[PDB]
Amino acid sequence: ITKVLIANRGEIACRVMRTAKKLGVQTVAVYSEADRNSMHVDMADEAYSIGPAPSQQSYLSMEKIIQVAKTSAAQAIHPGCGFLSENMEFAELCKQEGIIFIGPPPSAIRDMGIKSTSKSIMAAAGDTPRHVEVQVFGDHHGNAVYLFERDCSVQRRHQKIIEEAPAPGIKSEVRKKLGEAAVRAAKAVNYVGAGTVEFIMDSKHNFCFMEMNTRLQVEHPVTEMITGTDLVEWQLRIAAGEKIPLSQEEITLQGHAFEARIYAEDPSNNFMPVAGPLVHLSTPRADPSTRIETGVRQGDEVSVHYDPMIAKLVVWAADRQAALTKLRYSLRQYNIVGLHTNIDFLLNLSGHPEFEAGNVHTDFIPQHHKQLLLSRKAAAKESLCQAALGLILKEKAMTDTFTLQAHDQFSPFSSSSGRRLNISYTRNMTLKDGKNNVAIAVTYNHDGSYSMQIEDKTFQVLGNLYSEGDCTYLKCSVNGVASKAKLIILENTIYLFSKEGSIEIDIPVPKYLSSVGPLAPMTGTIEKVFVKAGDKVKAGDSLMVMIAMKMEHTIKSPKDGTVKKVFYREGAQANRHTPLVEFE
Amino acid sequence: ITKVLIANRGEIACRVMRTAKKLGVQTVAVYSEADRNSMHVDMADEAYSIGPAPSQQSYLSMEKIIQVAKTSAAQAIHPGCGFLSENMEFAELCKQEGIIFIGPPPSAIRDMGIKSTSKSIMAAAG
DSSP: OOEEEEOOOHHHHHHHHHHHHHHTOEEEEEOTTTTTTSHHHHHSSEEEOOSOSSGGGTTSOHHHHHHHHHHTTOSEEEOOSSSSTTOHHHHHHHHHHTOEESSSOHHHHHTTSSHHHHHHHHHTTOOOOEEEEEEEEEOTTSOEEEEEEEEOOOEETTEEOEEETTOTTOOHHHHHHHHHHHHHHHHHTTOOEEEEEEEEEOTTOOOEEEEEEOSOOTTHHHHHHHHOOOHHHHHHHHHTTOOOSSOTTSOOOOSEEEEEEEEBEEGGGSOEEOOOBOSEEEOOOOBTTEEEEESOOTTOBOOSSSOOEEEEEEEEESSHHHHHHHHHHHHTTOEEESSOBSHHHHHHHHSOHHHHHTOOOTTHHHHSGGGTSOOOOOOOHHHHHHHHHHHHHHHHHHHHHHHTTOSSTTOTTOSOOOOOSSSOEEEEEEEEETTEEEEEEEEEOTTSOEEEEETTEEEEEEEEEEEETTEEEEEEEETTEEEEEEEEEETTEEEEEETTEEEEEEOOOOGGGTOOOOBOSSSEEEEEEOOOTTOOBOSSOOOEEEESSSOEEEEOOSSOBOEEEEOOOTTOEEOTTOBOEEEO | OOEEEEOOOHHHHHHHHHHHHHHTOEEEEEOTTTTTTSHHHHHSSEEEOOSOSSGGGTTSOHHHHHHHHHHTTOSEEEOOSSSSTTOHHHHHHHHHHTOEESSSOHHHHHTTSSHHHHHHHHHTTO
């Protein structure tokens, strides 16, 4: 395979292409009208459009994908996940056309559609449940190996939210038994490729097979961290006709890995997906043990036509407890501004006394649902000091960039010092903390420090701004206590992202910026009235039409409410600046 | 240990914090008046002042370091080297307060203060 067409979008499209580039394989993608400026379009060497935004017209189409493969001279097609990945007719169409299908052959796909058929084929081959998934990888030469199983039990609305790579809570004998059983299952159905055999267990390790997946799944990067393998490379090699490069006796098991899936959704209403722009996107620090897979760039929008997922964060550490600490440490560095997400839920889900102990089963979240969605808490006075300082320094920044464009450079007045003559300057600002207003009196000190009195308590507040790449950080010292938080100010809302949480403080909007009865324009006769008493109009509504020296004037409503009286009936003469209707 | 207080300064404070960040552990430091703009203040997630520049008023103090650990909600204290690193009374104070002392227990520290005591204990072991 010198060129592969990836009939998919977003995170999975980029994950495969990065491997392809690493190997030297050219990548082609498709993007509909919807993904014209998505991540995988620029990562690909070439990409083709297809049609309208809904997936039925673009990614689920059988003929359009083949047509792209033929004109680009692709040698293989990778379906990824979710569109044609289980489409047996497409795999058969590729074979007949002459294109390599990267995945199991049609004979292995079709017999897996019916649950009773695979149950018999595999059977002939030998209270708090958990879902445990063990991987099988086979080739066209009769070989198969197993990779270590995952714990996929934590879910809500039958959607996986987090995943644990090494399946904690079992013994090495269980791991060996699941390996052999899944290989016998994969051979029983003559499976080739990267697949997954799903077992259900009780509390006493009585594993039973339920279902098998026949595609290279999105879950795999969490296992790669602990096995040290590259399954995308492996899948391409056996598709070209090669053998499994690494035998079942060479597969290791080191440490624990976790995935946390970040969705565009609002948990406050029992998770309905939301779609909107992302104004700020920042990822945790890169590290060989912290694998960051995103499908959304800053400036991109979440659509309604496709999966609302934004990113997957995968971490690795030496043991289970270290990985849970790293997962939460890095997850709090992931900052999304512009829409509501499930990040706070993920933090409360992982940082739960029962989850850290290991009390994991398929009903964990509905059992403890009330303990995961928590209400907003009031800001501390120190957090209000940080918000006030960030606002003051942002105003300074605006002053500094004005000065850089001035002729009168180096001059005084440019330093936002608040230096009054013989007296001090105190600025009275109000910040809105949730629903409540708090007044902060900020005194400008001669040495550049601030003394901020919030209600009665005075804080000695110092700090400045600094940049790291494309992000702005606020460096604070409040009463000798140093701290650092990312400072993002978007329209009215001050975002402070720290290692202890995220606080949103709103700037109140004055009345004269948020305000945006009627009179007669000239002395004319009224043609048509519209409304009477008891009606209700909303702003920008037709109340009356009047003709004044042959010029039709339609009155409108700047005001709002309900009309109490209409003073002029239709056909009467109204004069200049005479009131027409009234609001009581 | 999800958060550690490092009761030290300079090279050793930065050496430990770099590991902590690598592991995912939050770091708190102290800086007196003397180290307000030193390296470990900016590397830490949070740091507290204590008092006058001489070490007797800042890093050798037993109560000030515990007070910082309690208000920052630190789970463990790392003494590093040179200040409280051999202070057996501090290790005992941490135990009584409920804070993990990162180091040997007081029972292993106290018996090593007297050179003749450790000589006999080890000699009897071969």
